Amino acid sequence: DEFPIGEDRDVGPLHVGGVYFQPVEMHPAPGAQPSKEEADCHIEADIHANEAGKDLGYGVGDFVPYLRVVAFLQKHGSEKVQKVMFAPMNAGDGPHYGANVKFEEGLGTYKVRFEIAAPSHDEYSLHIDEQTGVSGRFWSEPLVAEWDDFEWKGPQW
Amino acid sequence: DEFPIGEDRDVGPLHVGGVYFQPVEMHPAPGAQPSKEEADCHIEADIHANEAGKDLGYGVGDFVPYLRVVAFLQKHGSEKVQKVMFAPMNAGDGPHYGANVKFEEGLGTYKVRFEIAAPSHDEYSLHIDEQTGVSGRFWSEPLVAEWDDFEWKGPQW
Ligand SMILES: [Cl-]
Ligand SMILES: [Cl-]
Ligand SMILES: [Cl-]
């Protein structure tokens, strides 16, 4: 049982989808994410190359590894913003950028914003020879996929 | 044009291929690798999950990111061993682990060994809960794909 954060987005060379479901147990446990027991849910940011996509050398539909994905959550009526740092991981259904999440502000409607940064300069490279290499270059400022009316009503499991 | 290092290998949950071709211009230029002009060739390790990889949650046949790949080159009859750190990068045909390399002891027959370590502890995780998790785990001892008789006969371009 998976529930959408909202409609999938196409931003630059990325096809971005967001879903949430029950908390999971991850090994190792990433950064400062809540445990399966402490968490409200698990949120997955699925990032696959789109047609644009190919200019960086990826095949359409391929998972795009080495990205740095963060989510910002803001409950409607509040000035507070919660930052969620996803981590790369595999589940039984494949790779994702994911995070166990506890909604600090509780039940309500949220603005949910994913910021997707390209790999760090020392973490990835592109072959750029004329004619034989790729023509595209990684984006400089993080790409954004946003949903303005995400409803968190508590566990649906 | 790509030239083979030797026969493809299946090691653990990985299918590993090795090819070499003319040195390339990479952006950013990775680690301490030689430039396109200084290098003898580019060596590429192609790594995809095999059937055993499904247990780690990878899609069978897909690229396996976040690994730490190092190549060791040793000319027959020599005690000198060159250590080459590979870096993740994209070419027109997708992601691979690779490096521009100089064959330090010149033309001849070399033993070529790729040692493939799992992702560092803080760089990747697996879901391990019953509902969404996997039953496999990352390997502790690095996996080895090696070719005892690679012939460096000079550029084929
Ligand atoms: Cl926000
Ligand atoms: Cl060796
Ligand atoms: Cl480690």
Cα of B74 vs centre of ligand 2, distance in Å, is 5
Minimum-distance CB partner of B59 among A57, A94, A124: A94
Contacts of A66 (CB under 8 A, 6+ apart): A119, A123, A124, B65, B66, B88
Task: Identify residues of A whose CB sits under 8 angstroms from chain B CBs.
Answer: 21-22, 24-30, 36, 42, 56-59, 62-63, 65-66, 87-95, 121-129, 132-134, 137
Strands B108-117 and B143-152: antiparallel
Instruction: Report the alpha-carbon distance of residue A130 to residue A91 in Å, rounded.
Output: 39
Whether A64 and B90 have beta carbons less than 8 Å apart is answered as no
User: What is the torsional sign of CA B101, B105, B108, B112?
Assistant: negative
The ligand placed nearest to the CA atom of residue B138 is 3
Instruction: Report the alpha-carbon distance of residue B124 to residue A87 in Å, rounded.
Output: 7
Strands A14-21 and B108-117: unpaired
Instruction: Report the alpha-carbon distance of residue B25 to residue A127 in Å, rounded.
Output: 6
Q: Which residues of A touch B133 (CB under 8 A)?
A: 24-25, 91-92
* HSE-up of residue A18 (Cα within 13 Å, Cβ side): 25
CB-CB under 8 Å, B129 with A92: no
Phi, psi (deg, nearest 5) at residue B37: -75, -35
Please, which experimental method was used?
X-ray
Q: Which residues of A touch B88 (CB under 8 A)?
A: 65-66, 123-125
Instruction: Report the alpha-carbon distance of residue A156 to residue A120 in Å, rounded.
Output: 37
User: Hey, what are B157's tokens?
Assistant: 């371009």
The ligand placed nearest to the CA atom of residue B112 is 2
Instruction: Report the alpha-carbon distance of residue A115 to residue B122 in Å, rounded.
Output: 21
User: Hey, what are B113's tokens?
Assistant: 């060994």
Instruction: Report the alpha-carbon distance of residue A112 to residue A119 in Å, rounded.
Output: 22
Say if residue B34 is preceded by a cis peptide, omega within 30 of 0.
no
Cα of B4 vs centre of ligand 2, distance in Å, is 18
Determine the Cα angle at A34 with ends A76 and A93, to 5°.
95
User: What is the torsional sign of CA A32, A33, A37, A40?
Assistant: positive
Minimum-distance CB partner of A57 among B90, B121, B125: B90
Resolution in angstroms, to 1 decimal, for this deposition?
A: 1.6
User: Hey, what are A149's tokens?
Assistant: 């009316």
Instruction: Report the alpha-carbon distance of residue B65 to residue B67 in Å, rounded.
Output: 6
Q: Helix, strand, or coil here: B70?
A: strand
The ligand placed nearest to the CA atom of residue B68 is 3
Instruction: Report the alpha-carbon distance of residue A92 to residue B127 in Å, rounded.
Output: 7
Residue boundaries of the structural domains of chain A: 1-157
How many cross-chain Cβ pairs, A to B, lie less than 8 Å apart? Answer: 134
User: Hey, what are A112's tokens?
Assistant: 């949910």
CB-CB under 8 Å, B57 with A91: yes
Using alpha carbons, list the distances in angstroms from residue A104 to B27, B40, B155: 41, 56, 60
Instruction: Report the alpha-carbon distance of residue B128 to residue B58 in Å, rounded.
Output: 14
Cα of A5 vs centre of ligand 1, distance in Å, is 14
CB-CB under 8 Å, A89 with B27: no
- Domain A1-157 class, CATH top level: mainly beta
Q: Which residues of B touch A129 (CB under 8 A)?
A: 24-25, 36
Q: Hunting for tokens 């005892």 — which residue is that? A: B148
Minimum-distance CB partner of A128 among B26, B65, B122: B26
Instruction: Report the alpha-carbon distance of residue A85 to residue B11 in Å, rounded.
Output: 33
Q: Hunting for tokens 């490096």 — which residue is that? A: B99
User: Hey, what are A95's tokens?
Assistant: 């790779």
